[PDB]
C-alpha cells in the first residue's frame, strides 16, 4: 500500500490501492507564510528521507462561500499554512507516457482548492490518465496587486505546479509532453491566462476550459484601487510589506467585503468611477500587471496565444442560475432591471426577447441568468473558439445541459453541475446534483475528457465557425448540436470586450 516516489524536493510516500497510486499534499512551493504570502512561489525546502504524501494538505485561505452558494457548493477546508501542494493519482508511477491532466480548481479566485472531494483524481487514474490537482494562492494573497510583490501569485503558483508536473510527472507515469490542463471557471480563466503568460510556455499540450474564458482579469489600475481599499480597511499600507502581517482572518474578512461590494454596485465614493461602472468582474481575478500578464487573456488568445494548445471548451447551459436562483429570488427580478443590464452592454431591451425566443428565459430573472451566462462565460468561450479558427491545434466545444433536480429544478444546468460528471464524483456532489444523477452521463463526460487528454480529440466533431458544433451533454441523450442559441449569440457581436 505505501508507494514512495522521488520528487524534485525529495521522496514522497503515497498510497497504492486497487491499481491506483495516490499522492496527496506533495509540496510544490514553500508555505506562503507572512511575507511569502506575496512572494513568488518558492521551491519546497528539499527534504531527506520520505515525506508523507497520503493526506491532502492545508488549503489556501478562503472565505466561506455566501450561504446560498455554500449550501450547494460545500467546500472542504483543510487548515494549515503548507497549502501550495499538489495531489497525484496515477495508475502506475512506472507507466510510460500517460496523459497527464492538471486540474486548476475554480472558485472565483477566492475559493476552491485542488483537494475538494469532487475533484478526486481516481476516476482519471483508473482510465490511464495521471491526474494532478493542486492549490494555488487565492484572493488577496493570490491576486491582490501590490507594488512590492510579484503580481498574480496564484497564477505563479499554477505555473509552479505545472512546472512541478513537467519536472516530476514522469516519475508518476505521466508524459510531461501530454499535459492537459483543465479547470472550471476561475480555473479555466486561469488556463486562458496561462495561455497568455510567457512563463507558462510549454507547460501544457491541451486545455479544457469548463465555463471559463479569457475575460476575467483586473485592469492594473483597478487592482491598485482594490488593494488601496483593502489596505485602507485594514488600516495598513497597500503593500505586501504591510499585508504580510495581517492575520488571515482579517484579510479574508476584508476580502469578502471587497468581493461582495464588487459583486453588487460598487459605491463610486469608495471604488471610483471605473469600478462603480463595472470595470471589474471578479476583484481577485488575475491582474493585467504588464509583466506576467500583458493583456486580457482573451486578447492574447485572439492574437494566437494557446493556438498550439488543443482546446476543449464548454459551458453549462444555465451556468449563472447558480448565483441567482437558489434562494427563490429570481422571480423578483424585473424586466426593467434586465433592460438596464442589457443597456450596460449597449443592447436594447428587446434583446431579452431573443433569450425568451430561444427558450433561455421566460421571466426577467431567467433571462438575466442567461444573459450573464452569455456575457461572462458562453460568449467569451465562443470568442476564444472563434479566435482559434486558424489555430494549428484542435478546438472542441461542449455544452453541459444536464439539469440538476435540486431546489425543484430551479437551477437547471447551473454552474458546477458538470464537475462531478467530469470527475465521476457524483456521490460527492449531491448537494448540487441531487441524490440520483445519471452515472452514465458522468461516464460519458469523464470518458470524453480522458479521450481529449489522451489524444486531443474528445470524440466528436471539432468546433469551427462554420457549424459551431458542440457536444450537448445531457441525460439520457448527449448529442452534437450546431450553432446553439444563434440569436442570443449574435446579440453580442459588437459588445465591448
Ligand X SMILES: O=C(OCCO)c1ccc(C(=O)OCCO)cc1
Ligand Y SMILES: O=C(O)c1ccc(C(=O)OCCO)cc1
Contact residues: ligand Y, CB under 6 A: 73-74, 118, 416, 419-420, 428-432
Closest CA to 193 of 157, 139, 148, 150: 157
Of the candidates 207, 244, 298, 376, which one interacts with ligand X according to CB under 6 A? 376
Q: Give the span between the Cα atoms of 53 and 51, in whole angstroms.
A: 6
Shortest Cβ 108–ligand X spacing (Å): 4
H helical segments located in 37-185 = 67-72, 122-126, 139-143, 153-168
**Of ligand Y, ligand X, none, which one does residue 106 interact with (CB within 5 to 8 Å by kind)?**
ligand X
Please count the residues of this chain forming the interface with ligand X, following the rule CB under 6 A. Answer: 14
Of the candidates 209, 282, 301, 432, which one interacts with ligand X according to CB under 6 A? 282
- 191-464-481-310 Cα dihedral, nearest 10 degrees: -30
Q: Does 192 bind ligand X (CB under 6 A)?
A: no
Cβ-Cβ contacts under 8 Å for 122 (sequence gap 6 or more): 20, 22, 89, 131
- Angle among Cα 345, 346, 352 to the nearest 5 degrees reads 80
Shortest Cβ 417–ligand Y spacing (Å): 6
Q: Give the span between the Cα atoms of 60 and 52, in whole angstroms.
A: 19
Q: Which is nearer to ligand X, 91 or 286 (CB)?
A: 286
The count of other CB atoms within 10 Å of the CB of residue 398 is 27
379-438: contacts with ligand X (CB under 6 A)? 415-416
**Would you state the cell numbers that stand for residue 393, as one nine-digit string?**
491545434
SS3 300: helix
Shortest Cβ 415–ligand Y spacing (Å): 8
Q: CA torsion sign, 288 to 292 to 297 to 300?
A: positive
Instruction: Name the closest residue to ligand X (Cβ).
Output: 106
Q: Which is nearer to ligand X, 99 or 420 (CB)?
A: 420
Shortest Cβ 220–ligand Y spacing (Å): 31
Shortest Cβ 419–ligand Y spacing (Å): 4
Q: Give the span between the Cα atoms of 47 and 4, in whole angstroms.
A: 14
**Of ligand Y, ligand X, none, which one does residue 376 interact with (CB within 5 to 8 Å by kind)?**
ligand X
Q: What character string, x for contact with ligand X (CB under 6 A) and - otherwise, covers 103-122?
A: ---xxx---x----------
Of the candidates 323, 396, 421, 460, which one interacts with ligand X according to CB under 6 A? 323
Q: Please, are residues 394 and 457 in contact by the beta-carbon 8 Å criterion?
A: yes
φ, ψ (nearest 5 deg) of residue 105 = -65, 155
Instruction: Name the closest residue to ligand Y (Cβ).
Output: 74
**Of ligand X, ligand Y, none, which one does residue 431 interact with (CB within 5 to 8 Å by kind)?**
ligand Y
Closest CA to 163 of 217, 100, 111, 121: 100
CA 304 to chain centre: 21
Shortest Cβ 429–ligand X spacing (Å): 11
Q: Which is nearer to ligand Y, 141 or 419 (CB)?
A: 419
Please choose, out of 44-52, 100-108, 305-313, 485-493, the segment that lies near ligand X by the rule CB under 6 A. Answer: 100-108
**Partners of 86 in beta bridges:** 26, 134
Q: Which is nearer to ligand Y, 429 or 491 (CB)?
A: 429
Q: Does 374 bind ligand X (CB under 6 A)?
A: no
For ligand X, the binding residues (CB under 6 A) are 73, 106-108, 112, 184-186, 281-282, 323, 376, 415-416
Amino acid at each position: 500500500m505505501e508507494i514512495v516516489i522521488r520528487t524534485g524536493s525529495g521522496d514522497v510516500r503515497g498510497s497504492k490501492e486497487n491499481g491506483i497510486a495516490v499522492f496527496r499534499g506533495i509540496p510544490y512551493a514553500e508555505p506562503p507564510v507572512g511575507a511569502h504570502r506575496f512572494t513568488a512561489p518558492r521551491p519546497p525546502r528539499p527534504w531527506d528521507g520520505v515525506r508523507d504524501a497520503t493526506e491532502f494538505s492545508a488549503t489556501a485561505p478562503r472565505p466561506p462561500y455566501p450561504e446560498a452558494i455554500g449550501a450547494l457548493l460545500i467546500e472542504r477546508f483543510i487548515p494549515g499554512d503548507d497549502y501550495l501542494t499538489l495531489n497525484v493519482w496515477t495508475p502506475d508511477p512506472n507507466a510510460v507516457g500517460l496523459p497527464v491532466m492538471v486540474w486548476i480548481h475554480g472558485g472565483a479566485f477566492t475559493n476552491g482548492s485542488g483537494s475538494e472531494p469532487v475533484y478526486d483524481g481516481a476516476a482519471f487514474a483508473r482510465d490511464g490518465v495521471v491526474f494532478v490537482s493542486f492549490n494555488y494562492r487565492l484572493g488577496i494573497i493570490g491576486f491582490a496587486d501590490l507594488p512590492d510583490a510579484p503580481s498574480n501569485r496564484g497564477l505563479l503558483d499554477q505555473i509552479a505546479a505545472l512546472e512541478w508536473v513537467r519536472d516530476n510527472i514522469a516519475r508518476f507515469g505521466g508524459d510531461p509532453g501530454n499535459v492537459t490542463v483543465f479547470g472550471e471557471s476561475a480555473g479555466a480563466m486561469s488556463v486562458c491566462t496561462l495561455m497568455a503568460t510567457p512563463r507558462a510556455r510549454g507547460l501544457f499540450r491541451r486545455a479544457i476550459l469548463q465555463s471559463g474564458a479569457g475575460n476575467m482579469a483586473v485592469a492594473a489600475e483597478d487592482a491598485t484601487t482594490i488593494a488601496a481599499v483593502i489596505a485602507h480597511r485594514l488600516g495598513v499600507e497597500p503593500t505586501a510589506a504591510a499585508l504580510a502581517h495581517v492575520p488571515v482572518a482579517q484579510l479574508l474578512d476584508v476580502q469578502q467585503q471587497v468581493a461582495q461590494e464588487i459583486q453588487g454596485a460598487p459605491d463610486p465614493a469608495v471604488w471610483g468611477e471605473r469600478i462603480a461602472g463595472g470595470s471589474v468582474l471578479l476583484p481577485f481575478a488575475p491582474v493585467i500587471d504588464g509583466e506576467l500578464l500583458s493583456q486580457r487573456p482573451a486578447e492574447a488568445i485572439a492574437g494566437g496565444a494557446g493556438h498550439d494548445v488543443d482546446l476543449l471548451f464548454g459551458t453549462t447551459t444555465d451556468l449563472y442560475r447558480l448565483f441567482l436562483a437558489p434562494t427563490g429570488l429570481l422571480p423578483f427580478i424585473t424586466s426593467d432591471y434586465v433592460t438596464a443590464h442589457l443597456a450596460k452592454s449597449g443592447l436594447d431591451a428587446d434583446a431579452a426577447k431573443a433569450y425568451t425566443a430561444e427558450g433561455r428565459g421566460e421571466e426577467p430573472g431567467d433571462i438575466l441568468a442567461s444573459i450573464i451566462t452569455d456575457q461572462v462565460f458562453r460568449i467569451p468561450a465562443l470568442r476564444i473558439a472563434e479566435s482559434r479558427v486558424d489555430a494549428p491545434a484542435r478546438t472542441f466545444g461542449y455544452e453541459f445541459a444536464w439539469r440538476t433536480p435540486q431546489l425543484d429544478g430551479i437551477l437547471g444546468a447551473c454552474h458546477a453541475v458538470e464537475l462531478p460528471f467530469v470527475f465521476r464524483t457524483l456521490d460527492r456532489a449531491a448537494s448540487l446534483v441531487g441524490t440520483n444523477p445519471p452515472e452514465e452521463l458522468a461516464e460519458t463526460v469523464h470518458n470524453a475528457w480522458v479521450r481529449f487528454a489522451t489524444s486531443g480529440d474528445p470524440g466528436w466533431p471539432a468546433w469551427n465557425p462554420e457549424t459551431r458544433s458542440v457536444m450537448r451533454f445531457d441525460h439520457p441523450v448527449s448529442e452534437m448540436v450546431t450553432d446553439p442559441y444563434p440569436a442570443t449569440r449574435a446579440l453580442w457581436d459588437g459588445v465591448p470586450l
